[PDB]
Each structure stands twice: as C-alpha cells, then as structure tokens.
C-alpha cells in the first residue's frame with residue numbers, strides 16, 4: 001500500500017470522527033501537504049494524527065476497527081467499499097485504559113492525550129512528538145539547525161553510470177547524461193510529483209531523488225512527512241532502472257512505520273544498500289539512502305545494518321565522511 005491520492009483530508013473526516021476528532025482548517029494546516037494542496041496517503045496522515053492526538057501509532061491497534069473504508073478511485077481518496085477499513089477500536093481503548101486513565105475520555109471527546117502528563121489538551125502537534133508504543137529502529141537527532149540546502153552534485157557525479165535521472169529539484173551533474181523530472185515547467189519531463197513518477201519516463205543507470213522535507217516539530221515528524229516521497233518517488237523509481245542500476249534518495253532515516261516498510265521494500269530489490277552522510281549534507285537529520293545493483297532476485301532484508309549506521313550518524317559515533 002502507501003499510495004498517494006487527492007482529497008485525503010475529506011476522506012479521513014469520518015474515520016477521525018470515530019475518535020471524537022473534528023479537525024478545523026487551522027489544525028489541518030499543521031499536516032504537511034494540506035496547505036500546499038498535494039496528494040498523500042490517507043493512512044500515513046491518519047498515523048500522524050493518531051500520534052499527535054493519542055501518543056500512539058497505528059500498530060497500537062487504536063484505529064483497527066473495520067468501521068470506515070478508505071479507497072482510491074480515479075486518483076481520489078473516498079469512502080467507497082474497500083478491504084482497508086479503519087475506526088476507533090473500543091476494545092483496544094479498554095485494553096489501554098489501565099496504563100492511560102484519561103485515554104478513554106480523549107477518544108470520546110477528540111482531545112489530545114498528553115502522554116507526558118496524562119492530561120487532556122486542545123490539539124497542538126508539539127505535545128506528542130513520538131509514538132510511545134513503537135520501538136524506534138534507530139536514534140533520532142536532538143539538535144536540528146537551519147542550514148543552507150545541501151549540494152549533492154559531487155556525490156552523484158562519482159556514482160558508476162552513464163544515464164542519470166534527477167527527480168525533483170534541479171541538479172547539475174558534471175560528466176554524465178542528465179535528464180530532469182520535475183514539476184518545474186522547463187524540466188526534461190514535467191508532471192506533478194505528488195502523484196508519483198509518470199509511467200512514460202525512460203529507464204536509467206542512476207536515479208537521484210533530490211527532494212527534501214521541511215523540519216517543523218521533530219525528526220520523527222520530518223521522517224513521517226517524507227515517507228510518501230519515498231513511496232511515490234524513491235520506490236517507484238526502481239521501475240525505471242536498467243539491470244544493475246543505482247537509486248539514491250535524500251532521506252531522514254525511517255523513524256516512522258511507513259518509511260521503515262518502504263525502505264525495506266526498496267532495499268530487497270538491490271544487491272547492495274547503504275546509508276551515507278557526505279560532507280556536503282548540512283541538515284543534521286538528512287541522509288542519503290544508496291541502493292546499488294538493481295535486480296529481480298528474491299531477498300530478505302535485515303535492517304540492522306542501515307539502522308546501526310543511522311544511529312551512529314545521528315548520535316555522532318560514526319567517523320565523518
């Protein structure tokens with residue numbers, strides 16, 4: 001799953017309402033993609049709101065009741081019948097009531113359950129920064145700072161390969177044949193990128209996903225908001241690789257369940273996968289996911305290696321590149 005479509009906020013209203021939640025426009029505006037009017041995954045957005053309101057992600061089972069369907073039709077989210085159904089699971093609420101005494105009241109009144117105090121509050125996306133039920137697969141950054149945009153032209157020019165696709169923001173790459181896929185109207189290939197890589201795009205030896213996600217509240221948030229970009233661009237980019245090709249993507253780890261699953265699904269498809277933070281990468285949370293040797297071999301993926309590298313990067317124990 002994890003497909004992007006339009007009108008996800010509208011489709012989510014009835015799901016959210018099972019937990020007494022009623023999002024105003026200003027509150028919706030704290031969801032990345034809302035203000036910019038871009039397509040998204042309803043599930044990823046639900047997950048984000050589940051954490052923000054109740055301090056728990058979807059793997060808690062909190063919205064596992066098959067109450068309200070979420071379907072995609074004609075690139076639009078809606079509530080037509082589907083095998084993917086969600087809604088407040090009252091049994092889970094009761095299962096959790098011992099540990100979280102006011103949680104039943106939170107989900108009855110659509111207020112935020114402050115996981116630090118146990119008290120209810122008005123919606124604010126800074127109260128519950130991480131899902132307390134999730135074993136985070138790697139360390140997160142404590143200190144994030146304002147850095148100028150990283151330049152990866154040096155990094156990509158040194159990858160093995162002749163034909164290159166840069167997806168997203170413009171990037172000159174000295175020494176190679178570079179095509180540019182973007183929403184900017186002068187790109188080699190032009191389209192909305194929130195709905196994914198257009199199927200008519202050719203095949204390439206290297207694809208570089210040069211797309212970033214704004215840091216607003218926390219490394220976790222940043223990660224979550226980039227997940228849909230991993231799915232719609234990075235993962236879809238694997239269908240546009242020649243045998244043995246390479247996909248490199250800007251990323252922030254996989255603090256959230258979706259990113260972890262998407263990166264896993266991408267890693268399985270390559271001989272080699274690694275995570276890098278070159279000297280040119282200033283933003284503390286930023287990393288490059290590096291997938292080399294695309295092929296059609298069936299594989300498993302142990303996340304220990306990438307996860308350990310991520311932790312070492314974000315805690316500062318890995319040598320500087």
Ligand code: NA
Nearest residue numbers: 269295296297
């Ligand atoms: Na494969």
